[PDB]
Design a binder for this molecule. Structure first.
Ligand code: ZN
Lengths: 94, 142
């Protein structure tokens, strides 16, 4: 459960790409874990995206609202930190 | 302290989100809940806001953009977005910075405006409501 105490032209907010960046220490298995856990990919697609991260240096995990993207990025980076991997997750305007 | 009516609004918003299996409770779930929160509703009525249209816009945006948790996962449940957390913290900060303690749905409404990349802030400004409009209502009524 949650503790709520303690936890002129006008354009709509833009959507954001959530990206996973490559590094030399994070195991392929962990990248796949992250893709399945935080992005709901199946083993097949998660594996393809992990290879893209590995060979292209970066890969787009998904496109979300600014608000959702920011949260997913923090959750992934916190998970990588807890598992002691330097897996970097970022975002940028779609 | 978040007042009783605000706590009721927050807890029911969170429960609705959990029942729909949303991965996140957003600032839009928050604004949708504030439409039936007396304090925030009064403020919006004083600003001549079409509450039926705003309700529909929020509901459409929520179901179309909020990711849903897989039917096969009980390790992780509905979580507030960072943006949602910031709004509550800001509402408390604003009230405390005035030397008071009671936080109402209207104070939370004021705090939403500071999440500039949120759809909720966009929709409020689309409905001709400014942060100052709400603060003036809180301080001086209609
Ligand atoms: Zn829903």
């Amino acid at each position: 459960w949650l503790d709520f105490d303690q936890l002129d032209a006008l354009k709509p907010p833009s959507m954001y790409k959530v990206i996973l960046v490559n590094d030399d220490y994070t195991p392929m298995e962990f990248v796949i874990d992250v893709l399945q856990k935080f992005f709901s990919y199946d083993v097949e697609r998660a594996t393809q995206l992990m290879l893209a991260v590995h060979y292209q240096g970066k890969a787009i995990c998904g496109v979300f609202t600014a608000e959702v993207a920011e949260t997913k990025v923090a959750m992934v980076n916190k998970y990588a930190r807890e598992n002691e991997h330097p897996l970097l997750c970022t975002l940028e305007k779609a | 302290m978040l007042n009783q009516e605000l706590e009721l609004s927050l807890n029911m918003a969170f429960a609705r989100a959990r029942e729909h299996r949303h991965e996140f409770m957003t600032v839009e779930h928050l604004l949708l809940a504030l439409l039936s929160n007396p304090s925030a509703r009064e403020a919006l009525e004083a600003c001549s806001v079409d509450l039926v249209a705003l309700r529909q816009e929020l509901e459409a945006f929520i179901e179309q953009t909020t990711p849903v948790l897989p039917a096969s996962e009980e390790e992780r449940d509905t979580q507030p977005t960072l943006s949602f957390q910031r709004v509550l913290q800001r509402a408390v900060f604003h009230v405390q910075s005035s030397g008071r303690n009671e936080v109402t749905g209207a104070n939370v409404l004021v705090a939403i405006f500071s999440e500039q990349e949120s759809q909720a802030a966009y929709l409020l400004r689309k409905h001709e409501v400014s942060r100052l409009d709400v603060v003036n209502f809180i301080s001086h009524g209609t």
